[PDB]
Structure formats: structure tokens, C-alpha cells
Design a protein around this ligand. Structure first.
Ligand code: NI
Length: 266
């Protein structure tokens, strides 16, 4: 009767909780504290799918584990909400970190609310109303961060990141990522690859590097020393407890750090 909705990543817990409020139950597929990049399906977690009515998926490359878990469960035909159905992607591998964008988060929130409404019509109007209030808060969060930005960065403001998570985030400043240290999503560089990346940061005069707060890497100190590139850190919104407010709290901090990096470039 009261929908039981599965989620895969922390941002989706925040989206669904804000959409449904107390009208439905939000169930994480994997426990808090586990790195979703390294998570391997456990029997205990696959069992949980059998008690759900629907699973919300990133479905564009950040939760492949969830499709495998569903296939191995008691409900392989469980309804699935493809959150990114209406989201413009980039770019050669499609970047799956659409949740680290205010505009793409609003699109995903609206898609989730519409789809949950079709599954639970008695609550369709409430889900729509809640999604619109949540989208208003996300726009305000972005406006508040931009209220601290004086100028756009100079033409020479090149940016690098350790994890390939921030292309959508930086796109909201009209900025691009020159280089990503990890050769592929969540893959540590070899010593030869890291040396080549350091050489590239120097050759292209990269100004800043955004590292990971969530599951940090031990070679970042070497990059800073060897390249002279200013270091800032961002959240993939993937560490610790699930909470309705996690997404907005950590995105506000992400946007403030990007603004600070630009402010400190001049
Ligand atoms: Ni990632």
C-alpha cells in the first residue's frame, strides 16, 4: 500500500526522500559507508529487493551493480525508474555523474516524481508539489553560491580533477575540465600515468586541481608538490549516512569551493 522505493547512491536517497516525504519508504540498496565504486553485490542486499515495489536508477553508468542485484533477486521484473531519461549528457565515455549538477538534479527529481506518481496515483499531486518545492531550494542554493562570485575566471583558468565527477558541476559556471588524473572511472593511475599527468599539468599551465573528500587517494600530495597546482577538494556525495538533506548540504559546499577557487585566481 505505502510504496517501498529502492535507491542506489546518496544523491538519489536525497531526491526520493524530498519527493515522497512521509508518504512512502526510501530503502538504500547498499549500506552506508561502502564506496559505490568498489561495492560487490552481497546476498543480504539482493534479498532486500524482494521487499520493494520499485527501484530508482542512475542507469547511465554509476549503478551497474544495481541491475545485477535486481537480476539475481526474487523480483527481476521489478519496476525501474530511469532517473536520467530526460537529462542531456556529455561526451569517449558518457559521464555518469549527472547528480553533481543542479540543472540535471532538477530534471532527475521531476522525472522521478512523475514516475512515482504513475505507480501511486493517490499521492501523484503531493509528489509533484514536493518535487517543485525541492527544485526551488536547489535553484536558491545555486543562486546563493553565485552571489559570492564577482567575475568569471580569466581565459587561462585551466582546471584538473582526480575523479571524473565534476564536468556537469563545472558546466554550471560555463567551465570545462582540462584533465582528469584517473585514467578511467574510479581507476587509480599507474606511476607512469601519474608522472605523465603531472607533466601535462605543467605543460598546459593548469591552475587548480579538485581532489576527492569522500574516498581520497594517497598520491595527491605528490601532484601538489611536483606540479605547483593549487589544491581544492570536492564531495562526490558518497560517504557516510543517507539523509534527505545530504545532497543540498554537500552541493552548497561544492559550489562554494568552486567559487572560492575562482575568487583566489585573481
Ligand atoms: Ni564516480
Amino acid at each position: 500500500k505505502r510504496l517501498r522505493i529502492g535507491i542506489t547512491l546518496h544523491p538519489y536517497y536525497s531526491y526520493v526522500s524530498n519527493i515522497v516525504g512521509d508518504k512512502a519508504e526510501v530503502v538504500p540498496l547498499i549500506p552506508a559507508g561502502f564506496n559505490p565504486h568498489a561495492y560487490e553485490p552481497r546476498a543480504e542486499d539482493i534479498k532486500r529487493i524482494g521487499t520493494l515495489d520499485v527501484v530508482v536508477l542512475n542507469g547511465v553508468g554509476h549503478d551497474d551493480f544495481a541491475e545485477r542485484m535486481i537480476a539475481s533477486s526474487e523480483k527481476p521484473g521489478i519496476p525501474v525508474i530511469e532517473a536520467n531519461a530526460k537529462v542531456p549528457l556529455l561526451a569517449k565515455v558518457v559521464n555518469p555523474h549527472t547528480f553533481l549538477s543542479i540543472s540535471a538534479s532538477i530534471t532527475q527529481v521531476n522525472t522521478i516524481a512523475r514516475e512515482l506518481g504513475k505507480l501511486d496515483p493517490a499521492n501523484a499531486k503531493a509528489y509533484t508539489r514536493n518535487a517543485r518545492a525541492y527544485a526551488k531550494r536547489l535553484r536558491a542554493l545555486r543562486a546563493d553560491a553565485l552571489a559570492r562570485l564577482n567575475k568569471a575566471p580569466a581565459a587561462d583558468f585551466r582546471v584538473a580533477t582526480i575523479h571524473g565527477a565534476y564536468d556537469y558541476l563545472l558546466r554550471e559556471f560555463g567551465l570545462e575540465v582540462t584533465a582528469v588524473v584517473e585514467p578511467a572511472h574510479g581507476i587509480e593511475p599507474s606511476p607512469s600515468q601519474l608522472k605523465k599527468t603531472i607533466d601535462q599539468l605543467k605543460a598546459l599551465d593548469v591552475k587548480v586541481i579538485f581532489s576527492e573528500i569522500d574516498f581520497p587517494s594517497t598520491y595527491v600530495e605528490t601532484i601538489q608538490r611536483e606540479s605547483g597546482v593549487k589544491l581544492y577538494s570536492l564531495s562526490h556525495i558518497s560517504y557516510g549516512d543517507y539523509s534527505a538533506g545530504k545532497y543540498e548540504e554537500e552541493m552548497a559546499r561544492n559550489l562554494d569551493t568552486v567559487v572560492r577557487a575562482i575568487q583566489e585566481s585573481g
